[PDB]
C-alpha cells in the first residue's frame, strides 16, 4: 500500500547523551530507524535536502524536533529488499514544535 | 561496655518481656486480626452485590 504521512521526530530524545562529534551521522541513522519503525520496510531512502537540513548547524548542533514527510512507494526491478522503499523529505515550517502526524493527500 | 549477647542484659530484657512489653503487642495483634475478620465481611457484601 503506497501511503504518505508526515511526522515530527524528537531528535532531542534520541540524540541525548551522544558525543558532539557523532550526533549528525547518528541523526541520519535515527531518522532511518524511525522510518523503518513506521513503514515496516528496510530500504529507507533520504532526500538530499533533508541531509542539508540535518547538517545545517555543523555536527554538534542538530535541532530538537524536525518535521518530516515519510513516503512509502514501490521499488523497481533488481531489488534486494522486495519490493517497497520509504522516501523521507523535509517540509517548510517556522517551528516544527506542536504538530500532529497527518496523512498527506496525494494528487 | 556490656555486649549484645551479655547474659545479664538478656535476663533483664526477659524481665521486661513478661510485663507491659508483650501485652501491648498482644493487644495490637487482636486489633489486627479483628480488622482481618472485618475484611471477610466487606468482600462477602460484594459477593452479595453480584448475588443480588
Amino acid at each position: 500500500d503506497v501511503v504518505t504521512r508526515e511526522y515530527t521526530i524528537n531528535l532531542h530524545k534520541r540524540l541525548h547523551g551522544v558525543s558532539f562529534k557523532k550526533r549528525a551521522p547518528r541523526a541520519v541513522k535515527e531518522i532511518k530507524k524511525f522510518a523503518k519503525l513506521h513503514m515496516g520496510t528496510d530500504d529507507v531512502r533520504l532526500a538530499p535536502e533533508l541531509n542539508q537540513a540535518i547538517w545545517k548547524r555543523g555536527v554538534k548542533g542538530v535541532e530538537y524536533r524536525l518535521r518530516l514527510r515519510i513516503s512509502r512507494k514501490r521499488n523497481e526491478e533488481e531489488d534486494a529488499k522486495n519490493p517497497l522503499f520509504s522516501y523521507v523529505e523535509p517540509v517548510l515550517v517556522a517551528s516544527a514544535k506542536g504538530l500532529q502526524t497527518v496523512v498527506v493527500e496525494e494528487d | 561496655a556490656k555486649s549484645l549477647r551479655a547474659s545479664s542484659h538478656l535476663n533483664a530484657k526477659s524481665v521486661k518481656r513478661r510485663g507491659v512489653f508483650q501485652k501491648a503487642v498482644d493487644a495490637r495483634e487482636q486489633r489486627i486480626s479483628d480488622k482481618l475478620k472485618e475484611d471477610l465481611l466487606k468482600q462477602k457484601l460484594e459477593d452479595l452485590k453480584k448475588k443480588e
Binding site: - | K16, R17, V20, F21, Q22, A24, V25, R28, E29, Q30, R31, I32, S33, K35, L36, E38, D39, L40, Q43
Partner: protein, 341 residues
C-alpha cells in the same frame, strides 16, 4: 568489609524470598506474618516527640520516611510443610481454581505467543463436588506442621508497566493448623488488605534486592549491588487508603491532599491504592518489589512502644526543588498566568 555479606554476588531474582519467619504461638488468632508491595517513594515528615528521657521530649523532630506502594494482596493458594530430619518438605500445594490474568502471566516468560492454557485441567479437576480438592486439604490438615499462604500482588492497580504479578509464600502464626488451612479455604480468590496485617507504631523488617551498581573496581574488585538484603526495625508511621482522600492530611495540617507529590514521585507514578509509610530508608530503589515481614520477636523498647503523632507530610516537588504542597498553593502564590487569562 563485612565477611557475613558473602559471597558478594548477584541475587537469584528481584523478588528476594524471606529467609526466616516469626516463631508461632498456638493460642493466638490467625493472622499474616509477612506482606509485600512495591517500594517507590521517599518523603519528609515533622512530628512532636513524646519520647521521655530524651533531649527532645515535648519538642518537634523532622525526619525522612519512605513510601512503599502496597495494593491489596490476593490469596491464590496454600502450602503445607512436614517437619523432617532433613528440614521442611512441601508435600501438597493447593490453588484457587480461578486465578487472575496476572498470575497465569507469571507462569510464562513469553506471554503473547502462548495459548494461555495454564490451569485448564486443574480447574476441570475441581469441576465436581470437590472430592479431590478436599482430599488434598485433608492431606494438609492431617500432616504438615507449618502452613504457608500463596499470594500475589495487584500489579495493574500499581502504575508499573510490568503487567506481571509476583507469587509469594507467607506463613501463618495463628494456632491450630486446622484454623490455618480453613482460613485459606475462606480466602481462595479473595484479597487481603494491608491494615489487616499491619497498623501504626509497629516495627517491621523490609527485605529488598539492593540497587544494582554493576561491575566495580581483602578489598576485592567485582560486583557491587543487586544483593538480597534484610533490614530490621523500621517503624510504620502510617497505613493509608486509596479511596480515602486526605491521606496527606494529619491531625495538624488537615488539608485535603494525597501523600503523592506534585507530578508524582520520580521515575514512578502516583499512589492509587493502599500504602505503608515506613520510617528511614528501605533497601532497593523506586519501582522495586519489597517484602515486609514483622519483627520475628517481641522487640519492645521505647523506640517500639511510643505512639507517633504525625504533624505534617511534605508533598512538595521531589522532581526539581520543593516550594508548594498542592497545585492549588502554586497558583495561589503565583497569581494568574498567561494561558489562564
Amino acid at each position: 568489609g563485612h565477611l557475613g555479606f558473602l559471597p558478594r554476588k548477584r541475587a537469584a531474582s528481584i523478588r528476594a524470598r524471606v529467609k526466616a519467619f516469626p516463631k508461632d504461638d498456638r493460642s493466638k488468632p490467625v493472622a499474616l506474618t509477612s506482606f509485600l508491595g512495591y517500594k517507590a517513594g521517599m518523603t519528609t515528615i515533622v512530628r512532636d516527640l513524646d519520647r521521655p528521657g530524651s533531649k527532645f521530649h515535648k519538642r518537634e523532630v523532622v525526619e525522612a520516611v519512605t513510601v512503599v506502594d502496597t495494593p491489596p494482596v490476593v490469596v491464590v493458594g496454600v502450602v503445607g510443610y512436614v517437619e523432617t530430619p532433613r528440614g521442611l518438605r512441601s508435600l501438597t500445594t493447593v490453588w484457587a481454581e480461578h486465578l487472575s490474568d496476572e498470575v497465569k502471566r507469571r507462569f510464562y516468560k513469553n506471554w503473547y505467543k502462548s495459548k494461555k492454557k495454564a490451569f485448564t485441567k486443574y480447574s476441570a479437576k475441581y469441576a465436581q463436588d470437590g472430592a479431590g480438592i478436599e482430599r488434598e486439604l485433608a492431606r494438609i490438615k492431617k500432616y504438615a506442621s507449618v502452613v504457608r499462604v500463596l499470594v500475589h500482588t495487584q500489579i495493574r492497580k500499581t502504575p508499573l508497566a510490568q503487567k506481571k504479578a509476583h507469587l509469594a509464600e507467607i506463613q501463618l502464626n495463628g494456632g491450630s493448623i486446622s484454623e490455618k488451612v480453613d482460613w485459606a479455604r475462606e480466602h481462595f480468590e479473595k484479597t487481603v488488605a494491608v491494615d489487616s496485617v499491619f497498623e501504626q507504631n509497629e516495627m517491621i523488617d523490609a527485605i529488598a534486592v539492593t540497587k544494582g551498581h554493576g561491575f566495580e573496581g581483602v578489598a576485592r574488585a567485582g560486583q557491587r549491588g543487586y544483593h538480597s538484603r534484610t533490614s530490621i526495625n523500621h517503624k510504620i508511621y502510617r497505613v493509608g487508603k486509596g479511596d480515602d482522600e486526605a491521606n496527606g492530611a494529619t491531625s495538624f495540617d488537615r488539608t485535603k491532599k494525597t501523600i503523592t507529590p506534585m507530578g508524582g514521585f520520580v521515575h514512578y507514578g502516583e499512589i492509587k491504592n493502599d500504602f505503608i509509610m515506613v520510617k528511614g530508608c528501605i533497601p532497593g530503589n523506586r519501582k522495586r518489589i519489597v517484602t515486609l515481614r514483622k519483627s520475628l520477636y517481641t522487640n519492645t523498647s521505647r523506640k517500639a512502644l511510643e505512639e507517633v503523632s504525625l504533624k505534617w507530610i511534605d508533598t512538595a516537588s521531589k522532581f526539581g526543588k520543593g516550594r508548594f504542597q498542592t497545585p492549588a498553593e502554586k497558583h495561589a502564590f503565583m497569581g494568574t498566568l498567561k494561558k489562564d487569562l
